[PDB]
JSON list of C-alpha atoms in Angstrom, two decimals:
[
{"chain": "A", "resi": 1, "resn": "UNK", "atom": "CA", "xyz": [-25.70, -29.29, -8.32]},
{"chain": "A", "resi": 2, "resn": "UNK", "atom": "CA", "xyz": [-25.61, -25.60, -7.43]},
{"chain": "A", "resi": 3, "resn": "UNK", "atom": "CA", "xyz": [-23.23, -24.25, -4.78]},
{"chain": "A", "resi": 4, "resn": "UNK", "atom": "CA", "xyz": [-24.10, -20.64, -4.03]},
{"chain": "A", "resi": 5, "resn": "UNK", "atom": "CA", "xyz": [-20.80, -19.15, -5.18]},
{"chain": "A", "resi": 6, "resn": "UNK", "atom": "CA", "xyz": [-19.74, -16.45, -7.64]},
{"chain": "A", "resi": 7, "resn": "UNK", "atom": "CA", "xyz": [-16.14, -16.47, -8.82]},
{"chain": "A", "resi": 8, "resn": "UNK", "atom": "CA", "xyz": [-14.59, -18.83, -6.28]},
{"chain": "A", "resi": 9, "resn": "UNK", "atom": "CA", "xyz": [-10.84, -18.91, -5.63]},
{"chain": "A", "resi": 10, "resn": "UNK", "atom": "CA", "xyz": [-8.03, -20.83, -7.34]},
{"chain": "A", "resi": 11, "resn": "UNK", "atom": "CA", "xyz": [-6.43, -23.56, -5.20]},
{"chain": "A", "resi": 12, "resn": "UNK", "atom": "CA", "xyz": [-2.99, -22.42, -6.35]},
{"chain": "A", "resi": 13, "resn": "UNK", "atom": "CA", "xyz": [-1.42, -19.77, -4.13]},
{"chain": "A", "resi": 14, "resn": "UNK", "atom": "CA", "xyz": [1.89, -18.52, -2.77]},
{"chain": "A", "resi": 15, "resn": "UNK", "atom": "CA", "xyz": [3.61, -19.86, 0.34]},
{"chain": "A", "resi": 16, "resn": "UNK", "atom": "CA", "xyz": [2.08, -17.89, 3.20]},
{"chain": "A", "resi": 17, "resn": "UNK", "atom": "CA", "xyz": [-1.22, -17.93, 1.31]},
{"chain": "A", "resi": 18, "resn": "UNK", "atom": "CA", "xyz": [-3.47, -20.94, 1.89]},
{"chain": "A", "resi": 19, "resn": "UNK", "atom": "CA", "xyz": [-6.91, -22.02, 0.68]},
{"chain": "A", "resi": 20, "resn": "UNK", "atom": "CA", "xyz": [-9.58, -24.47, 1.83]},
{"chain": "A", "resi": 21, "resn": "UNK", "atom": "CA", "xyz": [-10.65, -27.74, 0.21]},
{"chain": "A", "resi": 22, "resn": "UNK", "atom": "CA", "xyz": [-13.75, -26.05, -1.21]},
{"chain": "A", "resi": 23, "resn": "UNK", "atom": "CA", "xyz": [-11.66, -23.35, -2.86]},
{"chain": "A", "resi": 24, "resn": "UNK", "atom": "CA", "xyz": [-13.78, -20.44, -1.65]},
{"chain": "A", "resi": 25, "resn": "UNK", "atom": "CA", "xyz": [-11.69, -19.22, 1.29]},
{"chain": "A", "resi": 26, "resn": "UNK", "atom": "CA", "xyz": [-8.28, -17.54, 1.30]},
{"chain": "A", "resi": 27, "resn": "UNK", "atom": "CA", "xyz": [-6.00, -16.83, 4.26]},
{"chain": "A", "resi": 28, "resn": "UNK", "atom": "CA", "xyz": [-2.40, -15.89, 5.06]},
{"chain": "A", "resi": 29, "resn": "UNK", "atom": "CA", "xyz": [0.04, -17.50, 7.50]},
{"chain": "A", "resi": 30, "resn": "UNK", "atom": "CA", "xyz": [2.73, -16.13, 9.82]},
{"chain": "A", "resi": 31, "resn": "UNK", "atom": "CA", "xyz": [0.78, -12.98, 10.77]},
{"chain": "A", "resi": 32, "resn": "UNK", "atom": "CA", "xyz": [3.60, -12.04, 13.14]},
{"chain": "A", "resi": 33, "resn": "UNK", "atom": "CA", "xyz": [6.45, -11.50, 10.70]},
{"chain": "A", "resi": 34, "resn": "UNK", "atom": "CA", "xyz": [5.59, -10.29, 7.20]},
{"chain": "A", "resi": 35, "resn": "UNK", "atom": "CA", "xyz": [2.55, -9.15, 5.21]},
{"chain": "A", "resi": 36, "resn": "UNK", "atom": "CA", "xyz": [2.90, -9.46, 1.44]},
{"chain": "A", "resi": 37, "resn": "UNK", "atom": "CA", "xyz": [4.10, -12.84, 0.18]},
{"chain": "A", "resi": 38, "resn": "UNK", "atom": "CA", "xyz": [1.50, -14.25, -2.18]},
{"chain": "A", "resi": 39, "resn": "UNK", "atom": "CA", "xyz": [-1.92, -13.74, -3.76]},
{"chain": "A", "resi": 40, "resn": "UNK", "atom": "CA", "xyz": [-5.33, -15.29, -4.42]},
{"chain": "A", "resi": 41, "resn": "UNK", "atom": "CA", "xyz": [-7.24, -15.17, -7.71]},
{"chain": "A", "resi": 42, "resn": "UNK", "atom": "CA", "xyz": [-10.66, -16.48, -8.74]},
{"chain": "A", "resi": 43, "resn": "UNK", "atom": "CA", "xyz": [-11.15, -20.00, -10.08]},
{"chain": "A", "resi": 44, "resn": "UNK", "atom": "CA", "xyz": [-13.12, -18.76, -13.09]},
{"chain": "A", "resi": 45, "resn": "UNK", "atom": "CA", "xyz": [-13.17, -15.52, -15.13]},
{"chain": "A", "resi": 46, "resn": "UNK", "atom": "CA", "xyz": [-15.81, -13.03, -14.01]},
{"chain": "A", "resi": 47, "resn": "UNK", "atom": "CA", "xyz": [-18.66, -12.62, -16.51]},
{"chain": "A", "resi": 48, "resn": "UNK", "atom": "CA", "xyz": [-20.26, -9.38, -17.68]},
{"chain": "A", "resi": 49, "resn": "UNK", "atom": "CA", "xyz": [-22.18, -7.95, -14.74]},
{"chain": "A", "resi": 50, "resn": "UNK", "atom": "CA", "xyz": [-20.98, -10.66, -12.36]},
{"chain": "A", "resi": 51, "resn": "UNK", "atom": "CA", "xyz": [-19.66, -8.94, -9.24]},
{"chain": "A", "resi": 52, "resn": "UNK", "atom": "CA", "xyz": [-17.02, -10.84, -7.27]},
{"chain": "A", "resi": 53, "resn": "UNK", "atom": "CA", "xyz": [-17.80, -10.01, -3.64]},
{"chain": "A", "resi": 54, "resn": "UNK", "atom": "CA", "xyz": [-15.65, -11.00, -0.66]},
{"chain": "A", "resi": 55, "resn": "UNK", "atom": "CA", "xyz": [-15.85, -10.61, 3.11]},
{"chain": "A", "resi": 56, "resn": "UNK", "atom": "CA", "xyz": [-13.04, -10.11, 5.63]},
{"chain": "A", "resi": 57, "resn": "UNK", "atom": "CA", "xyz": [-13.02, -13.22, 7.82]},
{"chain": "A", "resi": 58, "resn": "UNK", "atom": "CA", "xyz": [-10.24, -11.88, 10.05]},
{"chain": "A", "resi": 59, "resn": "UNK", "atom": "CA", "xyz": [-8.36, -8.58, 10.25]},
{"chain": "A", "resi": 60, "resn": "UNK", "atom": "CA", "xyz": [-5.22, -7.99, 12.32]},
{"chain": "A", "resi": 61, "resn": "UNK", "atom": "CA", "xyz": [-4.70, -4.50, 13.72]},
{"chain": "A", "resi": 62, "resn": "UNK", "atom": "CA", "xyz": [-1.04, -5.14, 14.53]},
{"chain": "A", "resi": 63, "resn": "UNK", "atom": "CA", "xyz": [0.21, -3.70, 11.24]},
{"chain": "A", "resi": 64, "resn": "UNK", "atom": "CA", "xyz": [-0.51, -0.50, 9.32]},
{"chain": "A", "resi": 65, "resn": "UNK", "atom": "CA", "xyz": [-0.96, -1.99, 5.86]},
{"chain": "A", "resi": 66, "resn": "UNK", "atom": "CA", "xyz": [-4.08, -2.31, 3.72]},
{"chain": "A", "resi": 67, "resn": "UNK", "atom": "CA", "xyz": [-6.09, -4.73, 1.58]},
{"chain": "A", "resi": 68, "resn": "UNK", "atom": "CA", "xyz": [-5.60, -5.06, -2.17]},
{"chain": "A", "resi": 69, "resn": "UNK", "atom": "CA", "xyz": [-8.36, -6.22, -4.51]},
{"chain": "A", "resi": 70, "resn": "UNK", "atom": "CA", "xyz": [-9.20, -5.91, -8.20]},
{"chain": "A", "resi": 71, "resn": "UNK", "atom": "CA", "xyz": [-9.10, -7.81, -11.48]},
{"chain": "A", "resi": 72, "resn": "UNK", "atom": "CA", "xyz": [-6.53, -9.21, -13.91]},
{"chain": "A", "resi": 73, "resn": "UNK", "atom": "CA", "xyz": [-6.30, -10.46, -17.50]},
{"chain": "A", "resi": 74, "resn": "UNK", "atom": "CA", "xyz": [-3.99, -13.37, -16.71]},
{"chain": "A", "resi": 75, "resn": "UNK", "atom": "CA", "xyz": [-5.22, -16.90, -16.01]},
{"chain": "A", "resi": 76, "resn": "UNK", "atom": "CA", "xyz": [-4.47, -18.12, -12.46]},
{"chain": "A", "resi": 77, "resn": "UNK", "atom": "CA", "xyz": [-3.44, -21.48, -13.91]},
{"chain": "A", "resi": 78, "resn": "UNK", "atom": "CA", "xyz": [-0.33, -19.87, -15.38]},
{"chain": "A", "resi": 79, "resn": "UNK", "atom": "CA", "xyz": [-0.10, -16.58, -13.49]},
{"chain": "A", "resi": 80, "resn": "UNK", "atom": "CA", "xyz": [3.01, -15.35, -11.68]},
{"chain": "A", "resi": 81, "resn": "UNK", "atom": "CA", "xyz": [1.88, -14.32, -8.20]},
{"chain": "A", "resi": 82, "resn": "UNK", "atom": "CA", "xyz": [3.93, -11.12, -7.70]},
{"chain": "A", "resi": 83, "resn": "UNK", "atom": "CA", "xyz": [4.95, -9.54, -4.39]},
{"chain": "A", "resi": 84, "resn": "UNK", "atom": "CA", "xyz": [1.42, -8.18, -4.10]},
{"chain": "A", "resi": 85, "resn": "UNK", "atom": "CA", "xyz": [-1.83, -7.54, -5.98]},
{"chain": "A", "resi": 86, "resn": "UNK", "atom": "CA", "xyz": [-0.69, -4.02, -6.85]},
{"chain": "A", "resi": 87, "resn": "UNK", "atom": "CA", "xyz": [2.49, -5.61, -8.18]},
{"chain": "A", "resi": 88, "resn": "UNK", "atom": "CA", "xyz": [0.63, -7.29, -11.03]},
{"chain": "A", "resi": 89, "resn": "UNK", "atom": "CA", "xyz": [1.14, -6.60, -14.74]},
{"chain": "A", "resi": 90, "resn": "UNK", "atom": "CA", "xyz": [-0.20, -7.61, -18.13]},
{"chain": "A", "resi": 91, "resn": "UNK", "atom": "CA", "xyz": [-3.44, -5.68, -17.96]},
{"chain": "A", "resi": 92, "resn": "UNK", "atom": "CA", "xyz": [-4.22, -5.96, -14.25]},
{"chain": "A", "resi": 93, "resn": "UNK", "atom": "CA", "xyz": [-6.23, -3.45, -12.23]},
{"chain": "A", "resi": 94, "resn": "UNK", "atom": "CA", "xyz": [-5.79, -3.22, -8.45]},
{"chain": "A", "resi": 95, "resn": "UNK", "atom": "CA", "xyz": [-7.09, -0.91, -5.73]},
{"chain": "A", "resi": 96, "resn": "UNK", "atom": "CA", "xyz": [-4.53, 0.13, -3.11]},
{"chain": "A", "resi": 97, "resn": "UNK", "atom": "CA", "xyz": [-7.17, 1.68, -0.88]},
{"chain": "A", "resi": 98, "resn": "UNK", "atom": "CA", "xyz": [-8.99, 4.59, -2.49]},
{"chain": "A", "resi": 99, "resn": "UNK", "atom": "CA", "xyz": [-6.39, 4.31, -5.26]},
{"chain": "A", "resi": 100, "resn": "UNK", "atom": "CA", "xyz": [-6.99, 2.51, -8.55]},
{"chain": "A", "resi": 101, "resn": "UNK", "atom": "CA", "xyz": [-3.91, 1.30, -10.43]},
{"chain": "A", "resi": 102, "resn": "UNK", "atom": "CA", "xyz": [-3.22, -0.71, -13.58]},
{"chain": "A", "resi": 103, "resn": "UNK", "atom": "CA", "xyz": [-0.15, -2.87, -14.19]},
{"chain": "A", "resi": 104, "resn": "UNK", "atom": "CA", "xyz": [1.48, -1.09, -11.27]},
{"chain": "A", "resi": 105, "resn": "UNK", "atom": "CA", "xyz": [0.54, 2.44, -12.31]},
{"chain": "A", "resi": 106, "resn": "UNK", "atom": "CA", "xyz": [-1.76, 4.93, -10.58]},
{"chain": "A", "resi": 107, "resn": "UNK", "atom": "CA", "xyz": [-4.58, 6.19, -12.79]},
{"chain": "A", "resi": 108, "resn": "UNK", "atom": "CA", "xyz": [-7.35, 7.17, -10.37]},
{"chain": "A", "resi": 109, "resn": "UNK", "atom": "CA", "xyz": [-7.28, 8.36, -6.76]},
{"chain": "A", "resi": 110, "resn": "UNK", "atom": "CA", "xyz": [-9.73, 9.38, -4.03]},
{"chain": "A", "resi": 111, "resn": "UNK", "atom": "CA", "xyz": [-12.06, 6.69, -5.38]},
{"chain": "A", "resi": 112, "resn": "UNK", "atom": "CA", "xyz": [-15.54, 6.42, -3.90]},
{"chain": "A", "resi": 113, "resn": "UNK", "atom": "CA", "xyz": [-14.99, 3.19, -1.99]},
{"chain": "A", "resi": 114, "resn": "UNK", "atom": "CA", "xyz": [-12.03, 3.08, 0.39]},
{"chain": "A", "resi": 115, "resn": "UNK", "atom": "CA", "xyz": [-10.56, -0.37, 1.03]},
{"chain": "A", "resi": 116, "resn": "UNK", "atom": "CA", "xyz": [-8.15, 1.12, 3.57]},
{"chain": "A", "resi": 117, "resn": "UNK", "atom": "CA", "xyz": [-11.22, 1.90, 5.68]},
{"chain": "A", "resi": 118, "resn": "UNK", "atom": "CA", "xyz": [-12.17, -1.78, 5.91]},
{"chain": "A", "resi": 119, "resn": "UNK", "atom": "CA", "xyz": [-11.49, -3.59, 9.18]},
{"chain": "A", "resi": 120, "resn": "UNK", "atom": "CA", "xyz": [-13.62, -6.52, 10.30]},
{"chain": "A", "resi": 121, "resn": "UNK", "atom": "CA", "xyz": [-17.23, -5.71, 9.45]},
{"chain": "A", "resi": 122, "resn": "UNK", "atom": "CA", "xyz": [-16.96, -4.51, 5.86]},
{"chain": "A", "resi": 123, "resn": "UNK", "atom": "CA", "xyz": [-16.97, -6.55, 2.65]},
{"chain": "A", "resi": 124, "resn": "UNK", "atom": "CA", "xyz": [-15.87, -5.50, -0.83]},
{"chain": "A", "resi": 125, "resn": "UNK", "atom": "CA", "xyz": [-16.21, -6.78, -4.39]},
{"chain": "A", "resi": 126, "resn": "UNK", "atom": "CA", "xyz": [-15.20, -6.05, -7.97]},
{"chain": "A", "resi": 127, "resn": "UNK", "atom": "CA", "xyz": [-17.01, -6.03, -11.32]},
{"chain": "A", "resi": 128, "resn": "UNK", "atom": "CA", "xyz": [-16.17, -5.80, -15.02]},
{"chain": "A", "resi": 129, "resn": "UNK", "atom": "CA", "xyz": [-18.73, -4.05, -17.21]},
{"chain": "A", "resi": 130, "resn": "UNK", "atom": "CA", "xyz": [-19.25, -5.26, -20.78]},
{"chain": "A", "resi": 131, "resn": "UNK", "atom": "CA", "xyz": [-17.69, -2.02, -22.02]},
{"chain": "A", "resi": 132, "resn": "UNK", "atom": "CA", "xyz": [-14.59, -2.94, -20.05]},
{"chain": "A", "resi": 133, "resn": "UNK", "atom": "CA", "xyz": [-14.88, -0.78, -16.95]},
{"chain": "A", "resi": 134, "resn": "UNK", "atom": "CA", "xyz": [-13.76, -2.03, -13.54]},
{"chain": "A", "resi": 135, "resn": "UNK", "atom": "CA", "xyz": [-16.09, -1.19, -10.66]},
{"chain": "A", "resi": 136, "resn": "UNK", "atom": "CA", "xyz": [-16.30, -1.96, -6.94]},
{"chain": "A", "resi": 137, "resn": "UNK", "atom": "CA", "xyz": [-19.18, -2.95, -4.65]},
{"chain": "A", "resi": 138, "resn": "UNK", "atom": "CA", "xyz": [-19.40, -2.59, -0.87]},
{"chain": "A", "resi": 139, "resn": "UNK", "atom": "CA", "xyz": [-22.07, -4.46, 1.10]},
{"chain": "A", "resi": 140, "resn": "UNK", "atom": "CA", "xyz": [-23.90, -4.80, -2.21]},
{"chain": "A", "resi": 141, "resn": "UNK", "atom": "CA", "xyz": [-23.81, -1.14, -3.23]},
{"chain": "A", "resi": 142, "resn": "UNK", "atom": "CA", "xyz": [-22.45, 0.75, -6.23]},
{"chain": "A", "resi": 143, "resn": "UNK", "atom": "CA", "xyz": [-19.28, 2.78, -5.63]},
{"chain": "A", "resi": 144, "resn": "UNK", "atom": "CA", "xyz": [-18.56, 4.03, -9.13]},
{"chain": "A", "resi": 145, "resn": "UNK", "atom": "CA", "xyz": [-16.01, 3.36, -11.86]},
{"chain": "A", "resi": 146, "resn": "UNK", "atom": "CA", "xyz": [-12.38, 2.62, -11.01]},
{"chain": "A", "resi": 147, "resn": "UNK", "atom": "CA", "xyz": [-10.81, 2.25, -14.45]},
{"chain": "A", "resi": 148, "resn": "UNK", "atom": "CA", "xyz": [-11.75, 1.62, -18.09]},
{"chain": "A", "resi": 149, "resn": "UNK", "atom": "CA", "xyz": [-10.38, -0.26, -21.07]},
{"chain": "A", "resi": 150, "resn": "UNK", "atom": "CA", "xyz": [-10.57, -3.84, -19.81]},
{"chain": "A", "resi": 151, "resn": "UNK", "atom": "CA", "xyz": [-10.33, -7.06, -21.86]},
{"chain": "A", "resi": 152, "resn": "UNK", "atom": "CA", "xyz": [-13.25, -9.37, -22.74]},
{"chain": "A", "resi": 153, "resn": "UNK", "atom": "CA", "xyz": [-12.02, -11.85, -20.13]},
{"chain": "A", "resi": 154, "resn": "UNK", "atom": "CA", "xyz": [-10.83, -11.07, -16.60]},
{"chain": "A", "resi": 155, "resn": "UNK", "atom": "CA", "xyz": [-10.38, -12.75, -13.22]},
{"chain": "A", "resi": 156, "resn": "UNK", "atom": "CA", "xyz": [-11.08, -11.71, -9.63]},
{"chain": "A", "resi": 157, "resn": "UNK", "atom": "CA", "xyz": [-7.82, -10.79, -7.89]},
{"chain": "A", "resi": 158, "resn": "UNK", "atom": "CA", "xyz": [-7.42, -10.51, -4.12]},
{"chain": "A", "resi": 159, "resn": "UNK", "atom": "CA", "xyz": [-4.56, -10.03, -1.66]},
{"chain": "A", "resi": 160, "resn": "UNK", "atom": "CA", "xyz": [-4.33, -10.58, 2.09]},
{"chain": "A", "resi": 161, "resn": "UNK", "atom": "CA", "xyz": [-1.46, -8.62, 3.64]},
{"chain": "A", "resi": 162, "resn": "UNK", "atom": "CA", "xyz": [-1.10, -6.52, 6.77]},
{"chain": "A", "resi": 163, "resn": "UNK", "atom": "CA", "xyz": [-4.62, -5.40, 7.68]},
{"chain": "A", "resi": 164, "resn": "UNK", "atom": "CA", "xyz": [-6.32, -8.16, 5.68]},
{"chain": "A", "resi": 165, "resn": "UNK", "atom": "CA", "xyz": [-5.41, -11.76, 6.50]},
{"chain": "A", "resi": 166, "resn": "UNK", "atom": "CA", "xyz": [-8.37, -13.94, 5.51]},
{"chain": "A", "resi": 167, "resn": "UNK", "atom": "CA", "xyz": [-11.12, -13.50, 2.91]},
{"chain": "A", "resi": 168, "resn": "UNK", "atom": "CA", "xyz": [-14.25, -15.40, 1.87]},
{"chain": "A", "resi": 169, "resn": "UNK", "atom": "CA", "xyz": [-16.25, -15.21, -1.36]},
{"chain": "A", "resi": 170, "resn": "UNK", "atom": "CA", "xyz": [-19.97, -14.47, -1.10]}
]
């Protein structure tokens, strides 16, 4: 048994978004055209304390975009992959680089961890406290609290557009 995974990644994705046979590696296609055009969620709902970490396999410096990552309250089996992670609704928290949003609304800014700073050589992860507070983790370190008031069940959301292109779960 075993595997050495955490939250994994759902095999179902958009068009430009593609996953591996294992289901623990996400990547985008057509890097020389567009950025946002899909999404990648976890295979299973993150448990209390469980921190969904992910590394940046590849990062293109041709664009000026950023990487979006957070959590959602909608199952990936019946979720509607929006234009981007930040474009999620129905109780979904996303970080648009030093900016925490929920359902497409800014609530916190100047957050401790800055995803926009990432760029080949920096991993990031999310976590959902029992109380219902979304937190982030960089290189296995506490960054603080992004938002509060989360449901009892959530999933690890991740997006690969512009800067970010490929991601891998730890």
